[PDB]
Structure formats: C-alpha cells, structure tokens
C-alpha cells in the first residue's frame, strides 16, 4: 500500500538489476548515495571515483526519464550522513515505506553489515542475477571437490550457457584452445590506436569535483577516457569486437613498453559496474566467429576469461569469505616498497606498470600477475598491503574480483585455492614476453651483483625458502630439482643477495 524503497549501489547500474525489475513506479522510490564511507574505505584512484559517480548520476537520470522517483544524495549535500546505512535510515524517515528491496552487493563486509541493520521495515535481499553462476550454484558445484580447478568449472559454464556449443559438443571438438607458444611482439609490429571516450558534460562536472575534493587520492585524472553510460560502453565494445578481437589470442600475454592496452578489450571497468552485460558480450563474440569475422581460438580465449575466470573468482570469494581474507599461507610479513606508489624504481618493467596504473588506472592481466604480483610474492610483502595496492590503483577493482586474483592467483597467500601453484618467475620470463629488458639498467642474464636483475635472486630465494611446502604440490617439480643440484655456496650467495634487496627496497 505504501510502496518499496529500492537501493541501487554504485556497481549496480543496470536496467535489469534484480532490485528494479518489479517496481511500482507510482509508489516506489529508488535511493542512490554518493558515499564517502565507500569512497575512502580504500583511497581509490581518482579515475575510479570519476567513473562511478559520473555513471551513477547518468543512471539516475535514465531512471527518472523512465518514470522512477529517485532520491539521489550527492557528495556535496550537507545532510548526507556519509554511509549507505545512515542514508537508508534517513530515507525511511522522510516518507512511509512498506519494505526495503536491494540486490546483494560485491563486498562481504558491506553485505554482512546491511544484513544486520536494524530497520523499522523488512528488508528483502535479492541475488545479483547479472552474473551467470549464482552463489548457491557455485557452492553446489564445489561440494565434495578436493581441489577447485577453473578448467572443470569452465566446461560446466559452457554447457549451462550454450556458448560455443554445436549440439552437445564444443565447437571445434576441444573445450580449450590455449596455445603454449606465446611470444613477445615482433620488433616492427606497432600496437593499434585504441578508442577512448572524451568526457561528456556530466563526466566533466565530476572530474572537476574529484580534482578539487580528493586531491590526495592516487593517480592522474587528466586524460580520463573510460565510458560512463551504456552508449559509450557499447562503442568501446564495438571497437574491440570489430578491430581487436581477431588478434586477441595471439598477443594475450605479451608486454610492450609504454603500450599498456595492446589488443585487450578494456571493458572491465564498465562491466564491473553494470554498463555491459556478460552474456551479451559473449554472444557478440560468438557471433563474430560464427559469421567468419574472427578465428575460433581468439573468441574462445576471450569467452573463457568472462564465463570461466570472472565467474570462478566470484564463486571462490563468496564460498570462502570471511576466512579467505585472513589467510597468509606463506607467512609473508614484509612492507610494500614505496616505488609501488611513486614509480621511482630502476626496474623498467615495474616502473612501466606503475606508470600505466597512475596515468590510466589500468594494466592488463599478465602485467598485474607476472610483474607487480609476482614481485610482491617473491619479496614476501604482507598480503594485506598487496590487496590495498591492487584495490587502489585500478579502475576495475572491487573486493570480490581483486582479492581472489591477488591474495590467490598472484601471491599464493591462499595456499593454492584459486590458482593451484605459485606463479613465481625470474626475469627470464619477463625478458621472453616483453621488450623491457633491453632498455633496463639491470642485466637479466645475471643473478648476483649490483647490476643483476632483482627478480633473479628473489625467485631462487623464494623457491629455496618454501621448498618443503612446494614439494608434493606437484607442479614445482622442475625448479625444485634445479635447486637440489645447486651446491650450497651457490644457494648461500643468492640468499644473501635476496636479503640485501629486501633491505634496499624497504621491505624488511
């Protein structure tokens, strides 16, 4: 009789959100809050603040155009209590409501808090059915499995969604086309220019507000080019499918100095706040293969990242929280080096990754994994400090997707739940996959001395340190044998080198 209060959070900017689907436009009200609690829980990159608040403001206008009564509480409002819970209470004092309806969110701590709120009306929490696997479906799949392997989850999602299925068989006769012959770019191949979205008038307004009011947050705002509404996001997606997808598979793991985008889709910051739909993106990519515009290996590689990795890490997060966020399997206790924030390091690969984070709030997957993620793991940085960095510096970072990729896949702080084996690597890997080392001050062919690439001694120290644990893992057989044949003097030398580096870098 009085209507429902419907909450929409900053990463829920979708017409099809479960909290909106059955609204009574004549009686109901939508609440959206620009919340300083959420904006300072981590000190997010300036560009992430611009993206979320610009997109929120535009989504509110789209709802109003459709006939919704929207209560929009801006960051400038002098009565704004600052928190989601406080603003819910205040909305419930302003007029009569029958219930609150909301969609379960993407942060365990906020979800736990909202479920415990004492409110004068009932609250109904609906699952976020924008994702392709529900929380209960992942738990059912995971029951009774001694280890959770993404590849077997991926096969189930292929069958459930029907993507790249010809009848009951996978297209092409294999599930996966992952190649092992990944290489760096040929010396003459210049990566293509990428479409960036110039700030529209709403985004320009938010840009000025963030510059003036959050000047202490990490990162540059100049040159902001992320999409902030479904039209802008669709343009980015069209550009990727038409222009980039045919080469997606060839260069998925390559790195190139000062070319942070390469052939990646650049859609995660829009997808993670709801401006694009995961099933629609995948259908678009499948159609490009079916109609002869992209090869199957590229399209399968792309889809696997969305219905395989993205749904899998979300499943692990809700299955294992809150204990997951407390695990520190390798007892890492070091500090994060200051160059993660300033970029002021002679390691050319690290400096470039930090530069991309500062200027664009983006780096692609192998850079996050094998450069700054691997380095943090080898240094022994406390996982809390690594999660903080990955949450701050990237525009696509939300806890449900950051934490299993960071505490799990990149640093092995979860002891192998997400990724099975540590992704440890020496400089030889970065040299094989990038053009960084020819321009670097350090010599990637050396392990000891002031000119040695720091990854090389750090890698062997890490293997040495954890040799008993990594033994019986199964997938570390080759490094452990190599270490085993090393005379004690060789091992003592790289131990003392690794110790020196941790001091030089401010870790210990």
Ligand X SMILES: Cc1nc2c(=O)[nH]c(=O)nc-2n(C[C@H](O)[C@H](O)[C@H](O)CO)c1C
Ligand Y SMILES: Cc1cc2nc3c(=O)[nH]c(=O)nc-3n(C[C@H](O)[C@H](O)[C@H](O)COP(=O)(O)OP(=O)(O)OC[C@H]3O[C@@H](n4cnc5c(N)ncnc54)[C@H](O)[C@@H]3O)c2cc1C
Q: Are 185 and 250 in contact (CB under 8 A)?
A: no
52 binds ligand X (CB under 6 A): yes
Choose the stretch contacting ligand Y; rule: CB under 6 A; options: 2-10, 215-223, 290-298, 402-410.
Answer: 402-410
Query: Residues 15-34 vs ligand Y: string with x where CB under 6 A?
Result: --------------------
Take residue 190 and report the two structure tokens written for it. Answer: 């210049």
Q: Please, what is the minimum distance in Å from the beta carbon of residue 149 to ligand Y?
A: 15
378 binds ligand SF4 (CB under 6 A): no
Q: Are 370 and 429 in contact (CB under 8 A)?
A: yes
Take residue 169 and report the two structure tokens written for it. Answer: 């068989």
Q: Over 84-141, what HEC string results?
A: HHHHHHHHHHHCCCCEEEEECCCCHHHHHHHHHCCCCCCEEEECCCCCCCCHHHHHHH
Q: Are 329 and 413 in contact (CB under 8 A)?
A: yes
Query: Residues 419-448 vs ligand SF4: string with x where CB under 6 A?
Result: --------x--xx----xx--x-x-x----
366 binds ligand SF4 (CB under 6 A): no
d(CA 400, CA 397): 9
255-274 positions binding ligand Y, by CB under 6 A: 264-268, 271-272
Query: 214 or 442, CB closer to ligand SF4?
Result: 442
Take residue 373 and report the two structure tokens written for it. Answer: 């993620």
217 binds ligand Y (CB under 6 A): no
- Residue 124's φ and ψ, nearest 5 degrees, are -110, 125
Residue closest to ligand X, measured at CB: 10
The residues, any chain, with a CB within 8 Å of residue 384's CB and separated by 6 or more, are: none
408-447 positions binding ligand Y, by CB under 6 A: 409-410
Q: Please, what is the minimum distance in Å from the beta carbon of residue 445 to ligand SF4?
A: 9
349 binds ligand SF4 (CB under 6 A): yes
305 binds, among ligand SF4, ligand X, ligand Y, none (CB under 5 to 8 A by kind): ligand Y
351 binds ligand SF4 (CB under 6 A): no
The residues, any chain, with a CB within 8 Å of residue 382's CB and separated by 6 or more, are: 328, 332, 333, 334, 335, 336
348 binds ligand SF4 (CB under 6 A): yes
Residue with tokens 């997109």: 55
Q: Are 451 and 443 in contact (CB under 8 A)?
A: yes
Residue 161 has a CB neighbour count (10 Å cut-off) of 19
Choose the stretch contacting ligand X; rule: CB under 6 A; options: 99-107, 287-295, 301-309, 494-502.
Answer: 99-107
Q: Are 52 and 273 in contact (CB under 8 A)?
A: yes
* Cis geometry, peptide bond prior to residue 322 (ω within 30 degrees of 0): yes
Query: Residues 451-490 vs ligand SF4: string with x where CB under 6 A?
Result: --x-x-----------------------------------
Query: Residues 377-416 vs ligand X: string with x where CB under 6 A?
Result: ---------------------x------------------
Question: Which residues are part of a known binding site?
Answer: 10-11, 33, 35, 38, 53, 106, 252, 264-268, 272, 349, 362, 365, 368, 396, 405, 437, 440, 453
């Amino acid at each position: 009789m009085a209507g429902a209060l419907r909450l929409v959070l900053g990463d829920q900017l979708s017409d099809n959100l479960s909290a909106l689907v059955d609204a009574d436009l004549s009686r109901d009200q939508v609440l959206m809050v620009e919340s300083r609690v959420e904006a300072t829980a981590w000190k997010h990159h300036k560009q992430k603040l611009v993206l979320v608040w610009s997109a929120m403001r535009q989504f509110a206008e789209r709802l109003r155009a459709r006939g919704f009564n929207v209560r929009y509480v801006t960051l400038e409002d002098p009565d704004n209590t600052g928190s989601i819970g406080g603003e819910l209470r205040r909305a419930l004092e302003a007029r009569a409501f029958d219930r609150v309806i909301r969609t379960a969110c993407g942060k365990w701590g906020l979800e736990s808090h909202l479920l415990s709120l004492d409110l004068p009306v009932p609250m109904e929490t609906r699952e976020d059915d924008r994702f392709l696997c529900s929380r209960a479906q992942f738990a059912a799949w995971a029951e009774g499995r001694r280890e959770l392997r993404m590849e077997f989850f991926y096969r189930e999602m292929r069958r459930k969604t029907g993507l790249l299925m010809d009848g009951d068989q996978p297209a092409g006769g294999r599930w996966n086309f992952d190649a092992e012959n990944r290489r760096k770019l040929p010396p003459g191949l210049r990566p293509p220019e990428r479409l960036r979205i110039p700030p529209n008038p709403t985004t320009q307004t938010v840009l000025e507000q963030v510059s003036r009011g959050f000047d202490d947050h990490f990162g540059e705002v100049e040159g902001f080019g992320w999409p902030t509404n479904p039209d802008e996001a669709t343009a980015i997606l069209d550009h990727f499918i038409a222009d980039m997808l045919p080469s997606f598979g060839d260069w998925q793991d390559a790195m190139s100095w000062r070319r942070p985008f390469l052939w990646h889709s650049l859609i995660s910051p829009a997808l993670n706040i709801g401006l694009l739909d995961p099933l629609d993106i995948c259908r678009r990519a499948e159609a490009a293969w079916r109609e002869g515009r992209a090869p199957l290996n590229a399209v399968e590689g792309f889809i696997r990242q969305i219905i395989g990795w993205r749904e899998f890490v979300r499943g692990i997060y809700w299955l294992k929280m809150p204990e997951y966020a407390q695990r520190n399997a390798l007892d890492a206790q070091g500090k994060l080096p200051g160059f993660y924030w300033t970029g002021q390091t002679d390691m050319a690969c690290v400096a470039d990754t930090v530069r991309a984070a500062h200027d664009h709030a983006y780096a692609h997957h192998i850079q996050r994994l094998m450069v700054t993620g691997n380095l943090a793991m080898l240094l022994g940085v406390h996982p809390d400090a690594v999660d903080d960095w990955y949450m701050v510096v990237f525009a696509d970072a939300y806890e449900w997707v950051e934490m299993p990729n960071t505490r799990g896949m990149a640093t092995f702080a979860d002891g192998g739940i997400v990724g099975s084996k540590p992704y440890a690597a020496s400089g030889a890997y970065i040299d094989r996959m990038s053009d960084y080392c020819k321009g670097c001050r350090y010599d990637v062919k050396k392990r000891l001395g002031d000119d040695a690439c720091p990854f090389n001694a750090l890698y062997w120290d890490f293997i040495d340190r954890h040799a008993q644990r990594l033994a019986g893992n199964g997938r570390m057989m080759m490094p452990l044998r190599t270490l085993e044949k090393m005379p004690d003097a060789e091992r003592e030398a790289f131990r003392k080198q690794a110790r020196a580096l941790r001091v030089k870098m401010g870790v210990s």
